């Protein structure tokens, strides 16, 4: 206190002002954090997509590891597996197993 | 299908067919309210629906074994490294009131950059896999069918692979979980950027599964030099995680604050902690309160721990708790034992029911010191928010050591934990979503360009692949084992032997551990080593002292020890002999009224003992409504015999204290002899007793029943209605 001269500007706020100010700022703080989650991704977000598409944890590490090596993370690991499945006219499953073993990364870079 | 009250859980059979196992249901469940619920003689104002099967508190025997349940979900932490032993503990606690079973993860699971599989052994927790989760939920589906109330199953989503676990948890029907971006950054030094980008997806998957979410703030208690100074930080952390989770789509009513009262006696803990609790609950109206118990200010005394948990419960009762979690009383002493989880649940249930409707009689003086402090705390936390903003945001504030600082905010001691934005586990694994980024599944948080493949599918991005595992559960890949020696299967062949003998355990089958409590008339150190010796001299193995309290430096020392027992015992080679109640006795002497004549026979002046079994003071025949016509001491052979007649009595009762020349066993004779020699000895009973008297050398004197050193009124009255339900 310090504290005394710190709190001075809150001195006259009512509990409601004080509480809504508490939350107003909390929200100001987290907004740049939530906005990072909209605009970006990670190995685990991408693996978590692959789990939902029907691949094992083992197969998901395999695909994303390789996806990072091809600088393709920004397109989406699942999007990769899906586009290839379409193009080479196979199944989401086939294309994945395929990709997790090194096949088709060539074709995907275009 | 399966599960009968008297047949153990077939743990063997539960592990079968796990590949074909589906969760019986999804999401979190609260408890049912029971307005004015009647149980036995009592009305309850704060109770929930009772259980179909359970184990009532010990002193429930004095009220028809009623087992009333409070309104808050009661938690219990079960996770010993071998989940398959744990299952058995879950069924125990479940019956004792727990409906929220929380499985702590094996040490360091946060750092696992992916799911793991199968059933490796854990340390300080259970390794969290799809198999092991399927097992426990499958088992619980049974235990909740049995007890008759749904149990919420709970583990952790924390670490660098939250999205992963969150997918599997949502799939396998886990009901609740921790997830706090801040937890990963402050305590596991996971990189702050990637921690938060990840939590968006984690929390969205948990929003889908309707899971309860508990936050991490209770970790700030653990890490604080003094806990009674950390409150402004707690508030900030509870707030940043909540407003973050809300905006991700999580329901305001699924967002729980992990809130432990910061202190314990000898600190004036109610005084210190009550305003924070009130403040937090006012400031966080709308969110759920997940009250946890003290673990910081705790030691080896389980009595001390229990006393502080009740004051912990008092804080919850004086404010509110949606979830009331528990801590085992032996927590500061050893990894939790079976018996102490049941102490935890018993304690919680008993204190809450003991406080039933307390708030119709007690209320907070909200204006006074209480109200002022509530204010001040709100203000300190608002300041804390402001400095975070002035310093450029959350990341900046973490870079600057705002957190984990031993100061009382706005005090800053400069000893908090600084994480680097570009540093930490998972540093540099953050990728920017490209304009054509896409993700073909349910419950994805961030930018998702579906409209490139099909405008109409934007609200069901999962259709692109005719459903993801959240829609189509057969698309899930099950994995049984990866190690081949480190699995549940091995571990359980390891002791098929005991599953027809038996030995003690504390956590794992036949672990042989048991607890020894003793007092020794010497200094604490000496006696500590003295105890270990008696312990080995008692054939105990792996002996170690687990608690030591001074009674007084010179006079003695309390010592508690654990040790292993190096041998079993056959249930089969045990010899075991195959209850006339309080109410059964009082009621006989009503349908058929009863009367007695009692005296101290011989030249015996000792009146104490005879009086001991008559005076109601110590539950003597008087209590049961027997008519007693006492004659005094020195009463002669016949005056007692004559009396039963002269008074029309259904029994004579006499005592002998003095014993020289066997004068005691003797007198019982001339009493039986002068009971037949007159002619009363077949429509009357005759009982006697004394210091020196055995009920055996008494039947061998003609008198009907004997009573020796230590006979209470219960023993007499029980006999007096029995030898009368034979003749009469
Ligand atoms: C204090 C005491 C006295 C008191 C008696 C108190 C009183 N006014 O009632 C007075 C009265 C102070 C006393 C006198 C003497 N007594 Co004295 N008395 C004791 C002493 C220490 C107390 C025992 C007692 O109160 N019992 C407590 C109750 C709870 O136990 P209890 O009497 O055995 O009864 C229990 C059971 O017997 C049972 N029970 C008993 N009777 C009955 C009857 C029925 C129907 C049922 C169902 C159950 C039942 O239930 C009771 C509770 O569980 C005992 C020693 C002892 N521990 O035995 C002697 C003792 C019995 N008396 C003893 C002696 C020697 C004497 C004296 C001769 C000593 C002297 N002055 O020289 C004198 C004279 C005796 C006399 N005048 O009759 C000796 C006995 C010698 C012997 N075995 O023959 C004793 C054993 C002490 C001793 N070792 O010296 N003493
Ligand atoms: C939010 C969070 N994430 C992960 C972990 C630990 O998990 P790992 O080792 O980092 O994988 C913890 C543990 N601390 C709490 C223990 C029990 C407590 N008393 C309870 O209430 O929960 C945690 O709190
Ligand atoms: C040491 C550990 O690594 C795992 N693990 C992952 N893949 C394999 C594998 N192909 N063979 C054996 N163990 C494996 C575990 O599940 C385990 O117990």
Swiss-Prot record, chain A:
Class of enzymatic activity (EC top level): isomerase
Superkingdom of source: Bacteria
Thermal dependence of function as given in the entry: Optimum temperature is 37 degrees Celsius for native enzyme. Displays half-maximal activity at 23 degrees Celsius and 49 degrees Celsius. Rapidly inactivated at temperatures above 45 degrees Celsius. Loses more than 35% and 30% of its activity when stored at -20 degrees Celsius for 1 month and at 4 degrees Celsius for 48 hours, respectively.
Regulation of its function: Increased activity in the presence of dithiothreitol (DTT) in vitro. Inhibited by 1 mM potassium phosphate and potassium chloride. Inhibited by L-alpha-ornithine, D,L-alpha-lysine, L-beta-lysine (50%-60%), L-alpha-lysine (26%) and by delta-amino-n-valeric acid to a lesser extent. Significant decrease in activity is observed in the presence of 0.2 mM p-chloromercuribenzoate, N-ethylmaleimide and also by 2 mM iodoacetate to a lesser extent but not inhibited by arsenite.
This protein's record includes keyword Isomerase: yes
Reported function: The role of OraS remains obscure; however, it seems to be required for a correct folding of the OraE subunit. The complex is active only on D-ornithine and 2,4-diaminopentanoic acid and not active on L-ornithine, L-beta-lysine, L-alpha-lysine or D-alpha-lysine.
Record has Chloroplast as a keyword: no
Chemical reaction(s) catalysed: D-ornithine = (2R,4S)-2,4-diaminopentanoate
Classification via Pfam families: OAM_alpha
Subunit note: Heterotetramer of 2 alpha (OraS) and 2 beta (OraE) subunits.
pH dependence, record text: Optimum pH is 9.0 or between 8.5-8.7 (with Tris-HCl buffer). Half-maximal activity is observed at pH 7.4 and 9.7.
Enzyme Commission number(s): 5.4.3.5
GO molecular function: cobalamin binding; D-ornithine 4,5-aminomutase activity
Keyword set, alphabetical order: Isomerase
Protein name, UniProt field: D-ornithine 4,5-aminomutase subunit alpha
From Swiss-Prot, chain B:
Any one Gene Ontology molecular-function term assigned to this protein's record: cobalamin binding
Catalytic function, reaction form: D-ornithine = (2R,4S)-2,4-diaminopentanoate
Stored InterPro entries: Cbl-dep_enz_cat, Cobalamin-bd, Cobalamin-bd_sf, KamE_N, KamE_N_sf, Lys-AminoMut_A, Lys-AminoMut_asu_sf, OraE-like
Temperature dependence (free text): Optimum temperature is 37 degrees Celsius for native enzyme. Displays half-maximal activity at 23 degrees Celsius and 49 degrees Celsius. Rapidly inactivated at temperatures above 45 degrees Celsius. Loses more than 35% and 30% of its activity when stored at -20 degrees Celsius for 1 month and at 4 degrees Celsius for 48 hours, respectively.
pH influence on activity: Optimum pH is 9.0 or between 8.5-8.7 (with Tris-HCl buffer). Half-maximal activity is observed at pH 7.4 and 9.7.
Matching Pfam families: B12-binding, Lys-AminoMut_A, OAM_dimer
Binding site for substrate: 77, 156, 178, 290-292
Binding site for adenosylcob(III)alamin: 605-607, 655-660, 691, 711
UniProt keyword list: Cobalamin, Cobalt, Isomerase, Metal-binding, Pyridoxal phosphate
NCBIfam families registered for this protein in UniProt: ornith_mutase_E
Role played: OraE may be the catalytic subunit. Active only on D-ornithine and 2,4-diaminopentanoic acid but not active on L-ornithine, L-beta-lysine, L-alpha-lysine or D-alpha-lysine.
UniProt name for this protein: D-ornithine 4,5-aminomutase subunit beta
Species name: Acetoanaerobium sticklandii (strain ATCC 12662 / DSM 519 / JCM 1433 / CCUG 9281 / NCIMB 10654 / HF) (Clostridium sticklandii)
Gene that this sequence comes from: oraE
